[PDB]
Symmetry: none
Subunit: 296 residues, 2 copies
């Protein structure tokens, strides 16, 4: 049980300019010009008071994690409307990218993505943190060969000698959820593995919707009768076998993020043995530095 | 809206002897020998007529509060110069103690202090009283493990169905003050929470001066641009996150004294997970009784 000495940097709204609306709470593309530092950092700005407790728990989790495959918070801004300042991921979330480039994505990208998401999830294991909302919609694309886990709205830090997180009520994404989570609201790192399983499936199917046209009220019944999502077209049995293991009912039986890194990594060395696919800014951009190069 | 049946005990100056000057109005160390009661109570004696209205409003507030973490008035003395008789806090105020023992104070003390000040502030919520001058200089140390809130010069009792106290003019300690208080002279229990935030910061920094070398005229501007006090060295992010919430702009968004007790309490159970610190009378003293044991 070690002390968490992450820094939370508070920013002035004078130091950053919004530019466009990425979404609509309400994310903006922007540029952050710190202190007096001859650098301009491209940022995404997330702009009650239930919403405030929520958004500062998120800030807390996000500040205390540091990994190349995990979303980077640059700071907050304590304006009336609280603001999260994050690294800009120009290519948006992975669900969309995969849908918008369905026709042009190869084995090599797909597998490396499975690797990079496992690396991020393993780091979250190490930090004893449990994401609880892993899905392709919650992976961001920095560049097409570099993705990051994001959206820690539901993330929970595991306590001392505590291995489960019993949830209360609350709206939850059922179709990504493990069975123990859905019946008993228990959440573990293994639980997160189940969702990994479905995230991989979103990717292999180029962005299909798990259990399309089915009731979330049904899902639990299905899972228990022993149904799972079907084998995508693109998938060697080697790959599908890995998803299926993520959906084992005995959570301890599933693979650890550690092993998933190793497995997808071996595969990414000979991508086409494992997936069978047909076809295999602006302004004064001079002091621009990406968040990854802006440390402190 | 219930009747306030506090007692105000009037004392003869014949019943108490001054001994030394604690400060220079003009506080004295002294001993109070009541009635005919075989007890000697160590007291601090605070010795126009603007000053008199002021000092009897203080007496009023102080008489009507009763908590282990709130300064205890023993009575007044209606001599030409009006006198407040209080419990003696031998170790003086907390700002000084923390400065004078900078090098020797641990996580455990610091956190328990944050707890005891929250307990006192919550009691003041219950009694519908608003302190308006909370700061480390206005906490007294009875023993190093037992502190009390003091100085009710500015305290105001909230009325019937009244939730704010609009102030008039008057000199005010800006650097401890909430933003709504400073722009609009509004004061709430939440407002007091902001000051708690800074009181905690005084303690974590071992007695630094908030916003050193800055103009009180600036402060308001800063707070609004979204700057706050920086994260002290000693502080887990867990602790700092709590201060920052106390300085939220939407007062309703800040934590209640209730929650602050709970939070600091959890932390005081494993002090070093949360703070990272290097090094973690006289005469016939026979009928001496401390004020806390002198009831009526």
């Amino acid at each position: 049980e070690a002390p968490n000495q992450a820094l939370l940097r508070i920013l002035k709204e004078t130091e950053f300019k919004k530019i466009k609306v990425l979404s609509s709470g309400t994310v903006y593309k922007g540029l952050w010009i710190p202190e007096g530092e001859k650098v301009k950092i491209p940022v995404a700005i997330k702009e009650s008071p239930k919403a405030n407790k929520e958004i500062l728990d998120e800030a807390y989790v996000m500040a205390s994690v540091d990994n190349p495959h995990v979303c980077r918070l640059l700071g907050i801004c304590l304006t009336s409307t609280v603001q999260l300042i994050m690294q800009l991921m120009p290519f948006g979330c992975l669900l969309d990218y995969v849908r918008e480039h369905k026709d042009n994505i190869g084995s090599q990208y797909l597998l490396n993505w499975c690797v990079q998401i496992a690396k991020g999830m393993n780091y979250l294991e190490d930090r004893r943190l449990v994401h609880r909302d892993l899905a392709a919609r919650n992976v961001l694309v920095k560049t097409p060969q570099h993705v990051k886990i994001t959206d820690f709205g539901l993330a929970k830090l595991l306590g001392a000698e505590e291995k489960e997180y019993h949830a209360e009520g609350g709206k939850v994404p059922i179709k990504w959820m493990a069975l123990e989570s859905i019946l008993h609201r228990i959440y573990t790192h293994q639980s997160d593995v189940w969702s990994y399983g479905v995230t991989v499936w979103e990717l292999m199917t180029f962005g299909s919707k798990p259990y399309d046209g089915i009731p979330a009220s049904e899902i639990s019944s299905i899972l228990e009768k022993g149904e799972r999502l079907p084998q995508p077209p693109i998938c060697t049995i080697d790959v599908y076998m890995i998803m299926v293991k993520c959906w084992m009912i005995d959570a301890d039986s599933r693979p650890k993020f550690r092993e998933l890194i190793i497995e997808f990594s071996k595969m990414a060395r000979d991508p086409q043995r494992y997936l069978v696919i047909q076809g295999d800014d602006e302004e004064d951009m001079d002091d621009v530095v990406d968040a990854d190069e802006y440390l402190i």
